[PDB]
Amino acid sequence: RTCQSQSHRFRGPCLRRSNCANVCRTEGFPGGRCRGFRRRCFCTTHC
């Protein structure tokens, strides 16, 4: 299953997906996508 958990240590909006991906991959996740109302990066992990 795909589980998306927000990037807590993320800063700014998820507009720059590079920053989203960087945070998510460094935190040990496959990828980061947008899923929050406030344009929050969500790391998509596999459950």
Side-chain angles (χ1 to χ4, degrees):
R1 292 178 296 137
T2 36
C3 302
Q4 291 182 329
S5 306
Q6 61 171 30
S7 318
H8 184 254
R9 64 186 298 193
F10 184 78
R11 61 180 182 176
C14 62
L15 298 179
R16 187 63 186 166
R17 306 185 303 119
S18 317
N19 183 29
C20 184
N22 282 29
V23 175
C24 289
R25 195 61 180 162
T26 48
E27 296 303 277
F29 297 107
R33 310 300 170 209
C34 293
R35 181 62 285 170
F37 318 108
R38 299 181 292 185
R39 302 185 297 182
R40 173 63 62 163
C41 181
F42 278 62
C43 301
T44 311
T45 189
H46 186 247
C47 293

